[PDB]
């Protein structure tokens, strides 16, 4: 069947001199597998699934290095966006980024994502063609022109269509007994994956619940 | 795994 791997980043500015928050979370479908928190002593990408714990220190070392780079990038982004919108230093602001890939039943690239939101409103997004951008407003046109001239979509297409898919495939094989699992709603209770046809809620045991 | 590449908006 169809699977996906997604990365969700939130970064929240704090009034004045307070350093900002940064949350990195990773999912393979409806199962979270990794986390990185700014307000955590560890300062390391941490496993949130059993199957990812089998990975070597090199993996965890790299994932920590790459998230600290993303974190520093989004910290700069908060400062940039305040300027783009001509905002003050006392009011709290949020930057959200998501990226990832969907694979079909043959575990082959289906579709890719790469989008940002600022204060809960869409800011910029890579289109389904993975060549062009959707700039919500005049502030986001400064971003689109920078990313076009510097050929970002081509590099992002490379990761999404290839690397991203290869990782999704490695996780699916490693997490065999967890991710490839199909449940089985009761009449809708204790089913997996979450997609079904009140909002679908996590039972907290890996499965979900729904009401008619 | 995540991107090894970072860029500012």
């Amino acid at each position, epitope marked *: 069947g169809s699977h996906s791997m997604r990365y969700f980043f939130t970064s929240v500015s704090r009034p004045g001199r307070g350093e900002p928050r940064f949350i990195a979370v990773g999912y393979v479908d409806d199962t979270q597998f990794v986390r990185f928190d700014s307000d955590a002593a560890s300062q390391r990408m941490e496993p949130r699934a059993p199957w990812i714990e089998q990975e070597g220190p090199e993996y965890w070392d790299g994932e920590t*290095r790459k998230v*600290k*780079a993303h974190s*520093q*990038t989004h*910290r*700069v982004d908060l400062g940039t966006l305040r300027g783009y919108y001509n905002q003050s230093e006392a009011g709290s602001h949020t930057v959200q980024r998501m990226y990832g890939c969907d694979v079909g039943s043959d575990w082959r690239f289906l579709r890719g994502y790469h989008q940002y939101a600022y204060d809960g409103k869409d800011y910029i997004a890579l289109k389904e063609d993975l060549r062009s951008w959707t700039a919500a407003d005049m502030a986001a046109q400064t971003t689109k022109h*920078k990313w076009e*001239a*510097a*050929h*970002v979509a*081509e*590099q992002l*297409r*490379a*990761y999404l269509e290839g*690397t991203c898919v290869e990782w999704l495939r490695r996780y699916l094989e490693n997490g065999k007994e967890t991710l490839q699992r199909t449940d089985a709603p009761k009449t809708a209770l204790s089913f997996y994956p979450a997609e079904i046809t009140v909002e679908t809620r996590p039972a907290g045991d890996g499965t979900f619940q729904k009401w008619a | 795994g995540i991107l*090894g*590449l*970072v*860029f*500012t908006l």
Partner: T-cell receptor
Amino acid sequence: QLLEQSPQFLSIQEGENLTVYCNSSSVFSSLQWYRQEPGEGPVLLVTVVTGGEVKKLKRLTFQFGDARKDSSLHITAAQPGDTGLYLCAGAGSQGNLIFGKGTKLSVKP
Amino acid sequence: GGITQSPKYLFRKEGQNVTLSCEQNLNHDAMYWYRQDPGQGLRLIYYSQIVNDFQKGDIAEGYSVSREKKESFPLTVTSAQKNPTAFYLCASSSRSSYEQYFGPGTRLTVTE
């Protein structure tokens, strides 16, 4: 990611037309060419992004291969002022450029 | 704008720690340090994709870097660097992985 440059050395004659190669097995999202004189900073000649794309700068013609795994550097009517190390580089997955070892070109009078 | 590396020539007795300057007013997010031996290619030492983050290149042993400001990317040649005499080159790019713009280079010669 790896970039292989051929030939390592080329010693041609002033007036001759030559071609230097830069190949990989992996696709590169963008590619660069440089020229470096000894003990001086490399000068960027071009950036190629589209496969099949041909660009021209001074007496140089660059061509990015269709699959984007290779590029060539053609010099028309070479002058002794084309002497130097030619370096190709490509977009690195880890936030850097992937460099080839180069072609040392000597244009003899 | 431009990329500068001063001075052109650096001279030090073995055992001394030395700082190689690299500055740019090009508004480039990423900076790089390479070394090149005579009749040889470029070798990546250290690099920074964004301010407050750095990462090791292929030859990072005995070197150290700082990225406190978008504009500077100082390289320290430490006593632990076995073969320190080389031509050192700094470069910057708008964003990492894009076309790099090289500084003029610094020739460092370390003496017995």
